[PDB]
Design a protein around this nucleic acid. Structure first.
Ligand SMILES: [Mg+2]
Ligand SMILES: [Mg+2]
Lengths: 55, 121, 114, 98, 67, 104
RNA sequence: AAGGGCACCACCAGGAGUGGAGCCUGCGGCUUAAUUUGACCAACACGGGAAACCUCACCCGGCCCGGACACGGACAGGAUUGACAGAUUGAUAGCUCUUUCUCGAUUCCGUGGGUGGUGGUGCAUGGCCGUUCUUAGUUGGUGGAGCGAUUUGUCUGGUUAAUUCCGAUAACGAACGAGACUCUGGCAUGCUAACUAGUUACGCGACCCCCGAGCGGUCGGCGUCCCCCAACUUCUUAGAGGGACAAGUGGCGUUCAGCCACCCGAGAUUGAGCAAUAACAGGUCUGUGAUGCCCUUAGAUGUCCGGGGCUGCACGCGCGCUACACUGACUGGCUCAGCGUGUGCCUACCCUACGCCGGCAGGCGCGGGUAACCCGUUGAACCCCAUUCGUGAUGGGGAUCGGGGAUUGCAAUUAUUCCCCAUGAACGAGGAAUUCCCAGUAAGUGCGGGUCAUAAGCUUGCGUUGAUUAAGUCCCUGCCCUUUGUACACACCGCC
């Protein structure tokens, strides 16, 4: 359809409004500290950001 | 009699003072702006009622929006409410005012319990 | 103040930038013997230092490819213009870089070697 | 792609004025961040660059959620004779201060 | 599948010939037989529609209805 | 000018912060400014707990991560002006610095 | 089968329970157009899976191409695109139709060829992670033996949590794991520093005694980093260090490796993280622009939009919460925490002091806080002290259900949540069975974070109160090492 209904449904909040900043996944997001990264992607890159294991 | 006043007074009961006769949820609904879809549906029912023959019920009008709250000016219309599969035509009784349209087109049929299968050993 | 975010969010954003830049350099400099990324940030400007083996390969004709990557990192993260510089550094003892050796092994396997 | 000329030339000259261009993967983005005044949707520029890659005038690199198109040497003369330009004006990456 | 409705017929355009909806007479006298869209975004170059009960501007999308 | 400034340093490791907090104040004493004592703020520990598995099947083992952010406050105060005196920051990568004044 | 050692995912002695009742939640089954699906110690409050839309992958319908590139037709005398009205549509989808305007080379058609897919395949795979197995075990070289598969090394014994070490020794020299290591808690009146942490002293004050004290008592009242206009770091923070080693004494011990008791000491075993070889057709292609092969790709298994469902109930099961009360409930008063969060690239959405309105849920204006600067000295619960209740399904219990009032959102119905007044159901300690646990431990008790536009019965942590029992054993359930039997080797869930 035209622009009046193609993206008409609001996504200004809710689970569909948020996606992973790496793989654009819509499940298991980590919004803490504005990380905005998927759980799998965070485990993949936590050494790179700097979250290292201590205990 | 919705709140002690008759239906005739409800027909000319404007929205601003009608919210003091609805419940809290309906009053909050009407306090927020009704979108263009609801206004279009209201115009459609008005058109159907005015074009309806005298002493005879109007024609059926269909809709997906079942979150519409019932207004007194829609009494007597033939409205077909979607249930997820088909449109269910339903009367607007003079007792249905504070109730949403979705309550009168069930989204499931009631279960007829049969013999249990392999489970629950 | 209000314009600047909290320190925790700032460190998180720095880590995000580091990881994203590392991923971009990995996917872009895979055939150029990429080793790793080192960034030096100052309030004046930022300095990004790439560790790689073939500096002459990552650098295009008269530094064409290094200019291309500098423009890419300028555009994507929205730095102030001229506040980022890209240095390509030749690594020491490239046999000690597991990234470079793994990429070389992948290159060998893609070549058809057993 | 049904996108018009008036933004096609704009995207093309942005792509030629500097050797690269960066586009986030979001087909529903109302506006591409740079070239702000032209009011060009992001899907149009994404598919224009896809067509250019298909014809081989640009090569594409993909990070997490971004494209990193690199204009190639076959992209020089195509943009030149599409924009009707003499071979003296170069992208910034090609010639600097020389 | 087995869609209960038949496949929806997509519109095919009328394949209009040369426009020629304007005429001059006795060795040249302009006769606008189509309505003018007066807005700036329409301009004075384009003409309006000639519907049986209204006029429509292709660009300005205004509707002048005559009763 | 009469200037009294504040210098804050923060990073993720303690060795770099300590060596900066040492050499900077030593340079200040060699450059004869009196220095307000270094204030080590309480550490911000950023904890993230995440299931190790990417699927959910397993023994419910949670992976926990940390990020120790240490920040130090040093105030450089001189009877005369400061900024024209000291300009060299001498800052290695990995540590952040913000230079403010008493008014700021 | 024997011998030795070991474990509260085993037992003993106990504690708390579960299973008995209600409710929440997840599986199966039933029903459904659809109740998307995986997973069956090592699945069943798991997929960080607390779904109104989105999520969505399921169903009922409607659009768009977001089908590149190439070839050939098509066309500026129009390839083709948008759209007002009416009908039509759930729809103000020009989606289709009547009807004409308008964009102009970007498209259209067909042929190949893309491409995409939460489509399939974890029994094709990468990666991840779980389990074997957190037990202490594992391997190379050289040498010895055996025709060889293999064996010694890698052990009689003693010791340890530990093939941990001492000791013998056809072995020698190694290597991983364990250990070692990092964080954590416990002592540092030792050092450094402190207006974004305090203390002490002093000066203003304010109130009581003022009989009379007066350098009397209290102040989280104001001040002395306002720059000359006090000192100090114990309390707080975080760095550098120290500190504990079976070190000292007695005993046991081949007096070796070690073991028991005790003084001094803060501490004589703080909890974690990492964690070998080999393996599972263990789980994930529904995390990925990780991905092979197959399927679809224009009436779409793409994508978007509307709605419904994922909650649906004769029933079984799992984890939980609430309780069955007087060691209690209610009412009032008094009184102490610690993790840790707080305004955002897309992305709109923060923590909130204080003042006013309302009975409450909430609303109305002034601010603070991007943070040891404000919430906050986080005035928490439990508990403590007083009132009432009185052994009753009772003032325990609040399930079910009626009405009304607010919050968030586009939308609250299949009730989002909250508040008020109504009803008070089972339940009176729970069969056979069964879970977890040795000191700040179980358990009682609240508080943060995750999910959150709105939200916790879940989870991760934090703090408060705070124990009984035990310092053993192999009885069950298992594990390691040695010997032994084997007709097993997909390895006793075997073979026959
Ligand atoms: Mg009562
Ligand atoms: Mg025999």
């Amino acid at each position: 359809g035209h622009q009046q209904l193609y993206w008409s449904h609001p996504r200004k909040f809710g689970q569909g409004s948020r996606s992973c900043r790496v793989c654009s996944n819509r499940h298991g997001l980590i919004r803490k500290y504005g990380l905005n990264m998927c759980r799998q992607c965070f485990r993949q890159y936590a050494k790179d950001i700097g979250f290292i294991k201590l205990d | 009699t919705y709140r002690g006043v008759d239906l005739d007074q409800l027909l000319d009961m404007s929205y601003e003072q009608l919210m003091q006769l609805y419940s809290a949820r309906q009053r909050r609904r009407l306090n927020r702006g009704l979108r263009r879809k609801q206004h279009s549906l209201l115009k459609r029912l008005r058109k159907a009622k005015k074009e309806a023959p005298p002493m005879e019920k109007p024609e059926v009008v269909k809709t997906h929006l079942r979150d519409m709250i019932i207004l007194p000016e829609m009494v007597g219309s033939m409205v077909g409410v979607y249930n997820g599969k088909t449109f269910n035509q339903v009367e607007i009784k003079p007792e249905m005012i504070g109730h949403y349209l979705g309550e009168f087109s069930i989204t499931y049929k009631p279960v007829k319990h049969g013999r249990p299968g392999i489970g629950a050993t | 103040m209000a314009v600047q975010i909290s320190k925790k969010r700032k460190f998180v954003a720095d880590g995000i930038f580091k990881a994203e830049l590392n991923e971009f350099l990995t996917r872009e400099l895979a055939e150029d013997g990429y080793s790793g990324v080192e960034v030096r940030v100052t309030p004046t400007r930022t300095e990004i230092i790439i560790l790689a083996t073939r500096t002459q390969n990552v650098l295009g004709e008269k530094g064409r490819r290094i200019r291309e990557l500098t423009a890419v990192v300028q555009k994507r993260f929205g730095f102030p213009e001229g506040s980022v510089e890209l240095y390509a550094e030749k690594v020491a003892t490239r046999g000690l870089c597991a990234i470079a050796q793994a990429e070389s092994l992948r290159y060998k396997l893609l070549g058809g070697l057993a | 792609m049904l996108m018009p000329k008036k933004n096609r030339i704009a995207i093309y000259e942005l792509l030629f004025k500097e050797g690269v261009m960066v586009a986030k993967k979001d087909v529903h983005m109302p506006k591409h961040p740079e070239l702000a005044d032209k009011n060009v949707p992001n899907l149009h520029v994404m598919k224009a660059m896809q067509s250019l890659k298909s014809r081989g005038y640009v090569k594409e690199q993909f990070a997490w959620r971004h494209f990193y198109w690199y204009l190639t040497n076959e992209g020089i003369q195509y943009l030149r004779d599409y924009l009707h330009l003499p071979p003296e004006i170069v992208p910034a990456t090609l010639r600097r201060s020389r | 599948y087995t869609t209960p409705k038949k496949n929806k017929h997509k519109r095919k355009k009328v394949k209009l010939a040369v426009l020629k909806y304007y005429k001059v007479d006795e060795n040249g006298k302009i006769s606008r037989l189509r309505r003018e869209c007066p807005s700036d975004e329409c301009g004075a170059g384009v003409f309006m529609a000639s519907h049986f009960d209204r006029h429509y501007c292709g660009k300005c999308c205004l509707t002048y209805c005559f009763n | 000018a009469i200037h009294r400034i504040r210098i804050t340093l923060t990073s993720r490791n303690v060795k770099s912060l300590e060596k900066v907090c040492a050499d900077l104040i030593r340079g200040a004493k060699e450059k004869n400014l009196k220095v307000k004592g270094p204030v080590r703020m309480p550490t911000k520990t950023l904890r993230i707990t995440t299931r190790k598995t990417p699927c959910g099947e397993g023994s419910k083992t949670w992976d926990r991560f940390q990020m120790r952010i240490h920040k130090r406050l040093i105030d450089l105060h001189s009877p005369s002006e400061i900024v024209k005196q000291i300009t060299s920051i001498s800052i290695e990568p990995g540590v952040e610095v913000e230079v403010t004044i008493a008014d700021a």
